[PDB]
Amino acid sequence: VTPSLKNFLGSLIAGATVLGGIALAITAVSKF
Amino acid sequence: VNIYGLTATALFIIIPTSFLLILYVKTAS
Amino acid sequence: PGLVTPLGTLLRPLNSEAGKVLPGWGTTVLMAVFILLFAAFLLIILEIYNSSLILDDVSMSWETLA
Amino acid sequence: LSTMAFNLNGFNFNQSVVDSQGRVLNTWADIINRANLGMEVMHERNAHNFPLDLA
Amino acid sequence: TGRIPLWLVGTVVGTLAIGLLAVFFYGSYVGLGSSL
Amino acid sequence: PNPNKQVVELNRTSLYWGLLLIFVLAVLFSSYIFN
Amino acid sequence: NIELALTLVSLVLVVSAGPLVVVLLSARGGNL
Amino acid sequence: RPFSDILTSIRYWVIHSITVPALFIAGWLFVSTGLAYDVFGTPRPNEYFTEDRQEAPLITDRFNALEQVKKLSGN
Amino acid sequence: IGTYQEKRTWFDDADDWLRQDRFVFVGWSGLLLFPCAYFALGGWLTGTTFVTSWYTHGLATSYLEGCNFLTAAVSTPANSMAHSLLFVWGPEAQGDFTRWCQLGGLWAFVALHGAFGLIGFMLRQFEIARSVNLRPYNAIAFSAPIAVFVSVFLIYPLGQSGWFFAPSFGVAAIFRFILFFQGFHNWTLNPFHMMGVAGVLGAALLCAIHGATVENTLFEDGDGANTFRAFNPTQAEETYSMVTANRFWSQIFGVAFSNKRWLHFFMLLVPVTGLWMSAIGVVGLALNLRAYDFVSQEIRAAEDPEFETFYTKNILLNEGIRAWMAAQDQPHERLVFPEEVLPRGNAL
Amino acid sequence: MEALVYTFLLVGTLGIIFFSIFFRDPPRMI
Amino acid sequence: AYGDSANVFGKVTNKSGFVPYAGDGFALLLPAKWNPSKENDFPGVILRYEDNFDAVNNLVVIA
Amino acid sequence: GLPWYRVHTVVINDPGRLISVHLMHTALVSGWAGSMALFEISVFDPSDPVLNPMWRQGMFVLPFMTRLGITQSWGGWTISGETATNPGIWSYEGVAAAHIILSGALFLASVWHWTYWDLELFRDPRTGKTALDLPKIFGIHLFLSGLLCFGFGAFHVTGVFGPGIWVSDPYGLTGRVQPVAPSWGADGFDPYNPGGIASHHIAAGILGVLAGLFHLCVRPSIRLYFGLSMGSIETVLSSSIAAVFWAAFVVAGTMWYGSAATPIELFGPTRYQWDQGFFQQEIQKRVQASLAEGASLSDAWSRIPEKLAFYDYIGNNPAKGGLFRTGAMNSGDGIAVGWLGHASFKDQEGRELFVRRMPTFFETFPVLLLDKDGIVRADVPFRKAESKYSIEQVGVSVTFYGGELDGLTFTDPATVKKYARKAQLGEIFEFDRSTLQSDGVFRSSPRGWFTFGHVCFALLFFFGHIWHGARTIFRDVFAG
Amino acid sequence: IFTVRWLAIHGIAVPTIFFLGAITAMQFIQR
Amino acid sequence: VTLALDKDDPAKEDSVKGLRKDI
Numbered sequence A: 001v002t003p004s005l006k007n008f009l010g011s012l013i014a015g016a017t018v019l020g021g022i023a024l025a026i027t028a029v030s031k032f
Numbered sequence B: 001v002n003i004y005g006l007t008a009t010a011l012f013i014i015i016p017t018s019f020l021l022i023l024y025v026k027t028a029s
Numbered sequence C: 001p002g003l004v005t006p007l008g009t010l011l012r013p014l015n016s017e018a019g020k021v022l023p024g025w026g027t028t029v030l031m032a033v034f035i036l037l038f039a040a041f042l043l044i045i046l047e048i049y050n051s052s053l054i055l056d057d058v059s060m061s062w063e064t065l066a
Numbered sequence D: 001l002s003t004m005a006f007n008l009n010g011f012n013f014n015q016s017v018v019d020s021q022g023r024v025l026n027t028w029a030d031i032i033n034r035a036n037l038g039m040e041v042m043h044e045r046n047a048h049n050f051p052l053d054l055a
Numbered sequence E: 001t002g003r004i005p006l007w008l009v010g011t012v013v014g015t016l017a018i019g020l021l022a023v024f025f026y027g028s029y030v031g032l033g034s035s036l
Numbered sequence F: 001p002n003p004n005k006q007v008v009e010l011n012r013t014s015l016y017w018g019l020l021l022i023f024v025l026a027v028l029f030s031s032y033i034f035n
Numbered sequence G: 001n002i003e004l005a006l007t008l009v010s011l012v013l014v015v016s017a018g019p020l021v022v023v024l025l026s027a028r029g030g031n032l
Numbered sequence H: 001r002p003f004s005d006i007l008t009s010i011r012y013w014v015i016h017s018i019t020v021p022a023l024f025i026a027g028w029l030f031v032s033t034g035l036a037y038d039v040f041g042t043p044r045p046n047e048y049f050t051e052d053r054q055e056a057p058l059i060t061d062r063f064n065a066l067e068q069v070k071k072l073s074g075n
Numbered sequence I: 001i002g003t004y005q006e007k008r009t010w011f012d013d014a015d016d017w018l019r020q021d022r023f024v025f026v027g028w029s030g031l032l033l034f035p036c037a038y039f040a041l042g043g044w045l046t047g048t049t050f051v052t053s054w055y056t057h058g059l060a061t062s063y064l065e066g067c068n069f070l071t072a073a074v075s076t077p078a079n080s081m082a083h084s085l086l087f088v089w090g091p092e093a094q095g096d097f098t099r100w101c102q103l104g105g106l107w108a109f110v111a112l113h114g115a116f117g118l119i120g121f122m123l124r125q126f127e128i129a130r131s132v133n134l135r136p137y138n139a140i141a142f143s144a145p146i147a148v149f150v151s152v153f154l155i156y157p158l159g160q161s162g163w164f165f166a167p168s169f170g171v172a173a174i175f176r177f178i179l180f181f182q183g184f185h186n187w188t189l190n191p192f193h194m195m196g197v198a199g200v201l202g203a204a205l206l207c208a209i210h211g212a213t214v215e216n217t218l219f220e221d222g223d224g225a226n227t228f229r230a231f232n233p234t235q236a237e238e239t240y241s242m243v244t245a246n247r248f249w250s251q252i253f254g255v256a257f258s259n260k261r262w263l264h265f266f267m268l269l270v271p272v273t274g275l276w277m278s279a280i281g282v283v284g285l286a287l288n289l290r291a292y293d294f295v296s297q298e299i300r301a302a303e304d305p306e307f308e309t310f311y312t313k314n315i316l317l318n319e320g321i322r323a324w325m326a327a328q329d330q331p332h333e334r335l336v337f338p339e340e341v342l343p344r345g346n347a348l
Numbered sequence J: 001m002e003a004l005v006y007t008f009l010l011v012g013t014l015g016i017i018f019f020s021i022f023f024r025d026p027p028r029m030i
Numbered sequence K: 001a002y003g004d005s006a007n008v009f010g011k012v013t014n015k016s017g018f019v020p021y022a023g024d025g026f027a028l029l030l031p032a033k034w035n036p037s038k039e040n041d042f043p044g045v046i047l048r049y050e051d052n053f054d055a056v057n058n059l060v061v062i063a
Numbered sequence L: 001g002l003p004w005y006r007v008h009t010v011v012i013n014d015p016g017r018l019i020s021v022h023l024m025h026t027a028l029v030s031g032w033a034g035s036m037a038l039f040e041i042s043v044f045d046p047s048d049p050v051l052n053p054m055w056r057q058g059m060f061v062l063p064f065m066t067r068l069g070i071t072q073s074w075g076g077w078t079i080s081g082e083t084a085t086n087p088g089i090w091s092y093e094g095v096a097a098a099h100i101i102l103s104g105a106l107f108l109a110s111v112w113h114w115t116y117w118d119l120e121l122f123r124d125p126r127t128g129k130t131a132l133d134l135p136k137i138f139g140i141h142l143f144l145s146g147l148l149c150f151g152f153g154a155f156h157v158t159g160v161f162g163p164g165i166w167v168s169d170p171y172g173l174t175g176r177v178q179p180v181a182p183s184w185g186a187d188g189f190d191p192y193n194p195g196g197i198a199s200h201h202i203a204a205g206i207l208g209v210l211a212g213l214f215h216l217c218v219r220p221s222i223r224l225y226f227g228l229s230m231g232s233i234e235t236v237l238s239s240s241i242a243a244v245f246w247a248a249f250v251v252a253g254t255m256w257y258g259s260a261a262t263p264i265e266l267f268g269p270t271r272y273q274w275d276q277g278f279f280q281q282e283i284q285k286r287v288q289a290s291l292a293e294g295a296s297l298s299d300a301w302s303r304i305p306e307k308l309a310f311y312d313y314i315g316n317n318p319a320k321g322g323l324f325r326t327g328a329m330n331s332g333d334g335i336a337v338g339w340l341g342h343a344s345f346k347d348q349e350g351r352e353l354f355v356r357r358m359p360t361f362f363e364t365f366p367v368l369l370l371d372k373d374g375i376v377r378a379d380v381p382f383r384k385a386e387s388k389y390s391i392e393q394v395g396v397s398v399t400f401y402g403g404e405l406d407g408l409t410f411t412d413p414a415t416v417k418k419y420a421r422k423a424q425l426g427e428i429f430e431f432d433r434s435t436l437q438s439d440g441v442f443r444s445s446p447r448g449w450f451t452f453g454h455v456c457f458a459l460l461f462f463f464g465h466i467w468h469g470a471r472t473i474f475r476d477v478f479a480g
Numbered sequence M: 001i002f003t004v005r006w007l008a009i010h011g012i013a014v015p016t017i018f019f020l021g022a023i024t025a026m027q028f029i030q031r
Numbered sequence N: 001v002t003l004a005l006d007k008d009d010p011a012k013e014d015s016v017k018g019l020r021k022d023i
């Protein structure tokens, strides 16, 4: 795996976590 | 600048003008 | 209506059903997965062209024609 | 425009940033000055017999 | 609320804000970015 | 017999605006057209 | 810097004079 | 509570009578300590020109930039 | 619900919460507008406060360096980066914040986040308008600002060598960008910019004339000097006389609006039209397709030395701007022009 | 004759403005 | 990341307006604002400096 | 009375006449396709395929026809420059005539669909009112679209049945339409990898077919249908406008940045090529090789192909053009006649001097001669009162190796300065600016013009998406 | 105590107060 | 003589050869 590809895949995971966190946040606030 | 240049300007100042005049005359009629 | 042409009758069933919807989000969740996957694909091709995602295989140059 | 007509030009921060030893650290203002110089040396190519354009 | 004249609060805070901007102009003619 | 049949409507101001625009645009691009 | 220091002292006293008059007048229900 | 009501609540003032001062002090210390120069790699007034390079640095290698910029910065 | 009654879903929950009366309308668009805008504007502040372009443009662009509000600016990345998105994890910064800032990564960060912020803002306009059940003319009008940003901060930079030749986020930076266009692209001569200037000047005239007319044709609905007091927020009758206004402009200017709707529609059409026209012109400059000069006069001036016009004079000025700024404005070109080669007029 | 073309365009624009002020639709509407 | 404290309320490094320079068997105080130049106007040019703005103001040391 | 900007809204609820109005647009497009092609063929010179390529002749549609295979012509000439032994029905003229005949057929079809707009097919069976199942209409159209995409990539491009696609060497010195093989690999995503076209079209095609079946079989979600107004024709229009404007940007970038789909010997060289000295480095490279072999400077420069040298010219740069500089590239610089040969500028000291090439961003660039070190050693001074790098005082002589001026040496200050000004514009070629009476200004290549036009359309269509999309979302408010 | 309104107020005010302190120190740095 | 780079650079300072491997 090219270092660029490895970093790119990692950034994708980071983006998913950032998005997932937003969903969790709105889920919790909507829940309460 | 050539015949084409003047022809372009002529058409641009004639085709649209005539079209507008026709519509107004039709509506005025 | 009217003008019932044979071609019209042949294609009639294609447009016969309409407004028919599936209750609930249906396949919306599956669609969302595809949208995300295709979005990732576009990012890869863009980064490769932008040279951000450097890959050993691709050469990203007119020399690729060679 | 009227004030500048009386030679009251806008802010001049040319060579305002200086390092420890005194070397001038150029800024965006300096780049704008570089262009201003070009327009100045060109305007009235034959209408200046002296360096200063006091007029 | 109470025991606090908001008009004074504004006058004081406003005076402090003027002072902060004055420090910026002071720094304009002193230290870095002073052309000297 | 299409019920969708309608008619275009051009008023005096609309006509004036159109003619003014077509002329102003010509005055603006005429110089560039003749380069 | 003594001159600068006492200069600032003067600025403080003079600038505070105007509000001082208002505050006092307001406190004693003056005609402000 | 209207902002005016809060801007009149002396309690609110007491609550920010320490936090706000600390926030400003921290900002002053940040720059005074020199942490800002290290955090953002902003050249200090005495390190803009190195003994090696007496001219503005020009990064020319895109994929070899990391090492280039570090060398230009004289590490 | 849904003209059929459906079971409530988590979406319905999140929907009501996001679309809920709140100090500020979060909505669904806010999930993009609030975060991106904060990072964009925040990055611009951090950059202008403590970030240097000494390694990107060799220029001091930070308050820490001693720059003021006007000089401080987030400069574009070096031309070596070309059209690289320059992520912090990118093949350049390689996850180094200090270097990412030194490489000019913040500029791309602010631009990218700001670009999506504008998209989120326009989406917010549609969202709020749909909730208020009103035609989203405001959102359609916000297309002109977005078009200008995309054409000047994206299309042009992409059409040129790299992000280096893009507007840097700074007062002085924008000024040098403007001067560069005149010297190299002759933006002023471009007909599309001309139409754009007409729109901005025309919109300003409309805004001023409309405010003056209305505020000067107001009816006496009060018994005090202050007319502003004499108005009811839920009044039905117009506060000013459209008739009186119509006659005044009909006699003073010769023509006057008679439909309030058309007047306001014209007030929003003029500015939007102008911005879009200038955007098309910037698209041409991106590809270097510019109306730099008229060959007809150029040939005449060359053959006839005496022949001269303000057009020829402006051409010479552009020649000086390019020759007396290229050395620094474009450091990648590494152009060392002997003073004798530079074009200088008599004296000066 | 490019100047003649330019003069025609300028004259034509002015003519439109003329009728737009004196031969305009009566402003029956406020 | 050398932890050099900012020169807050400190003293100016150099206000002489001249930076001492040393070359091959020749030494002189170059003007501080003047920047290094890379144009060999004449043969034997050893040191070449020019003003930040006007290039007319230049200095050449030929050996 | 519909306003002028709302006259074509009459067919919004007339599916029968909607096909007619669409048939008209298709006919007009087909007619222009064959018409413009016929005009270009009537104004095209295939005599010189080296110094007078199609892009230099300002041809626009001819490149596209050649890209997919059309190369011969009933004129007995090939785009390659050789005689068209058997152009066949698919000659440039043939394909043009075909499009024109298609246009006519579409016109007659439009007339019938307009007259007989009331077809029961449009009516819905449950109510009898005219209703279109947009959900299924997209599915059936998508399925057919996928079929063509896969077929084009697996046959026309692959070559198994289709003629093939135009493929050229990295320096476009030699290329033609040859069958390609799908890469089916990471390299397949390289924009300059021709094989990618076949692989992508085959992959995208098969998926499209499958996706079409899904839309045909699976019905839309109730929440999605209402949420996306899947019952509104304007809904598909707004989304479709979004797709076309998106593609336009992608197509433009592909043309500007260059790709295997945009041959440099069919659309002209890219501006970046000059910016990076692509062709220039090759010329110097092979020259150095020939010198390393032991050949004289004349021999090496003589080896350089004029076509390669022609590519190394600021004039061929697409960015070097004007918005209103209309005409073919040949006009404005003349019709290339031949190559004068490499110009070698040397000072009296014997030091080789290199003329700094003009950067694309610069309309006029000062002439500067620098040594290998990169130090300016000579130039044409604007002020000659007391020059220190004057070509005269530096004593610079230009010697041309290869080309017309092969072995020709020039010491005349004026002559040397003249060649120096040309050198800064790249390789020095002879141009006939009499036949076309060139104005002496550079023009943009069809590549640049295509990019400008499609980018402009794309930016405008963005407003179209927002407008039609806003109307669909606020249909209730816009209702009236 | 941490409503959206409160979060927004401290989302800008807290950073601004720090930035202001930093800018003030910068006004007293000597080259 | 001069290296291809020693020739491409003076002719075009932004040439890939001169703008690459510079580190």
Ligand code: CLA
Pocket (backbone or CB within 6 Å): L004, L005, L006, L007, L008, L009, L012, L241, L457, L460, L461, L462, L463, L464, L465, L467, L471
């Ligand atoms: C296939 C794309 C498409 C289609 C089918 C439509 C269809 C429609 N649009 Mg529309 N529009 C589009 C794209 C499209 N638009 C784009 C990209 C934009 C952004 C600029 C707009 C912006 C727009 C606005 C602002 C409006 C419409 C409106 C309308 C409706 C009225 C049409 C009309 O006024 O009669 C046409 C009568 C005319 C006199 C116009 C013809 C004059 C043109 C300029 C001359 C022809 C030039 C050339 C041949 C155009 C083709 C160029 C092409 C080859 C690249 C209609 C149903 C109107 C509406 O109310 O929406 C419902 C409306 O006001 N559109």
Ligand code: CLA
Pocket (backbone or CB within 6 Å): B008, B009, B010, B012, F025, F026, F027, F029, F030, F031, F033, L032, L036, L040, L043, L057, L058, L059, L060, L323, L324, L325, L326, L327, L328, L445, L446, L447, L449, L450, L451, L453, L454
């Ligand atoms: C995106 C579509 C597109 C593109 C990229 C091109 C590109 C090109 N065409 Mg072309 N053309 C097109 C569509 C297109 N065309 C269509 C639809 C037609 C049918 C009418 C033609 C008919 C055509 C002919 C007959 C010729 C070309 C030619 C050319 C080439 C010369 C450059 C040029 O066109 O002059 C420069 C382009 C401009 C200066 C644009 C004009 C500026 C705009 C219009 C603003 C004007 C606004 C103003 C209101 C206009 C009226 C003002 C008034 C005073 C008149 C060039 C590569 C020439 C050629 O090379 O021959 C093979 C040629 O002779 N084209």
Ligand code: CLA
Pocket (backbone or CB within 6 Å): C045, C046, C049, I150, I154, I155, I158, L183, L184, L185, L187, L188, L189, L190, L191, L196, L197, L199, L200, L203, L204, L205, L207, L208, L245, L246, L249, L250, L251, L253, L254
């Ligand atoms: C093994 C199978 C295979 C292979 C080898 C390839 C190979 C390739 N595909 Mg591909 N693809 C496949 C399967 C495959 N594909 C499948 C199954 C699908 C789904 C059907 C796709 C869908 C797909 C799409 C949609 C695209 C490709 C593209 C490409 C090419 C990449 C170059 C490129 O990105 O264009 C150039 C660079 C870009 C497209 C990146 C830019 C994208 C931006 C976001 C577009 C701009 C939009 C925006 C409105 C612009 C705003 C203004 C701007 C100034 C900012 C490449 C040769 C691209 C292509 O067609 O090349 C033209 C592309 O667009 N493929």
Ligand SMILES: C=Cc1c(C)c2cc3nc(c4c5[nH]c(cc6nc(cc1[nH]2)C(C)=C6CC)c(C)c5C(=O)[C@@H]4C(=O)OC)[C@@H](CCC(=O)OC/C=C(\C)CCC[C@H](C)CCC[C@H](C)CCCC(C)C)[C@@H]3C
Pocket (backbone or CB within 6 Å): I033, I037, I040, I041, I042, I044, I110, I111, I114, I115, I116, I117, I118, I119, I121, I125, I138, I139, I141, I142, I144, I145, I149, I168, I169, I170, I171, I174, I200, I203, I271, I272, I275
């Ligand atoms: C300098 C000129 C100019 C500016 C600064 C400007 C600014 C603004 N216009 C807005 C709106 C509008 N403008 C409109 C028409 C126009 N706007 C015009 C000209 C301008 N408009 C013109 C000429 C017109 C007439 C055609 C309309 C119709 C609207 C609106 O509806 C909207 C509004 O409601 O205004 C009150 C606001 C939307 C902000 C936003 O997206 O929120 C979120 C913030 C975001 C997305 C951050 C953007 C970040 C930017 C793009 C990049 C980074 C910039 C740095 C932080 C700072 C750089 C500083 C240097 C440039 C000096 C904003 C205050």
Ligand SMILES: CC(C)=CCC/C(C)=C/CC/C(C)=C/CC/C(C)=C/CC/C(C)=C/CC/C(C)=C/CC/C(C)=C/CC/C(C)=C/CC/C(C)=C/CC1=CC(=O)C(C)=C(C)C1=O
Pocket (backbone or CB within 6 Å): F024, F027, F028, I194, I195, I196, I198, I199, I200, I202, I203, I205, I206, I209, I210, I211, I213, I214, I242, I245, I246, I249, I253, I255, I256, I257, I258, I263, I269, I270, I271, I273, I274, I277, J010, J011
């Ligand atoms: C020999 C000769 C003739 C020499 C002259 C040569 C010469 C100088 C040539 C130049 C010609 C020329 C004009 C060139 C410019 C070309 C150009 C830049 C064209 C741009 C075209 C274009 C479409 C631009 C896009 C942007 C755009 C749409 C701008 C529109 C600008 C515009 C028209 C704005 C309004 C201007 C204006 C004067 C408004 C008056 C409004 C008005 C009547 C108010 C009255 C009024 C107001 C109220 O508030 C109320 C309440 C009422 C009741 C009311 O009534």
Ligand SMILES: CC1=C(/C=C/C(C)=C/C=C/C(C)=C/C=C/C=C(C)/C=C/C=C(C)/C=C/C2=C(C)CCCC2(C)C)C(C)(C)CCC1
Pocket (backbone or CB within 6 Å): E017, E018, E020, E021, E022, I038, I039, I040, I041, I042, I043, I044, I045, I046, I106, I109, M012, M015, M016, M019, M020, M023
């Ligand atoms: C980039 C980035 C990021 C973000 C960041 C941010 C967001 C930041 C922020 C920052 C900030 C948030 C800052 C602030 C600023 C502000 C300031 C600095 C202020 C200013 C003011 C002044 C200077 C004033 C003046 C004057 C006047 C005029 C008024 C009153 C007062 C006075 C008088 C003084 C993240 C995380 C995503 C990661 C990645 C990267």
Ligand SMILES: CC1=C(/C=C/C(C)=C/C=C/C(C)=C/C=C/C=C(C)/C=C/C=C(C)/C=C/C2=C(C)CCCC2(C)C)C(C)(C)CCC1
Pocket (backbone or CB within 6 Å): L027, L028, L029, L030, L031, L032, L033, L035, L100, L101, L102, L103, L104, L105, L107, L108
């Ligand atoms: C009837 C018939 C026939 C015939 C047909 C034909 C003849 C066709 C063709 C037709 C045609 C012949 C078509 C075409 C048309 C044209 C077009 C379609 C174009 C247009 C143009 C445009 C649209 C453009 C515009 C513009 C300008 C100019 C400026 C710039 C920009 C632009 C470019 C955009 C036949 C035999 C078949 C048989 C059957 C019947």
Ligand code: OEX
Pocket (backbone or CB within 6 Å): D043, D044, D053, D054, D055
């Ligand atoms: O005339 Mn107009 O202008 Ca104001 O400066 Mn002095 O004098 Mn001229 O010079 Mn530069």
Ligand SMILES: [Cl-]
Pocket (backbone or CB within 6 Å): D042, D043, D044, D045, I313, I314
């Ligand atoms: Cl002048």
Ligand SMILES: [Cl-]
Pocket (backbone or CB within 6 Å): D047, D048, D049, D050
């Ligand atoms: Cl004088």
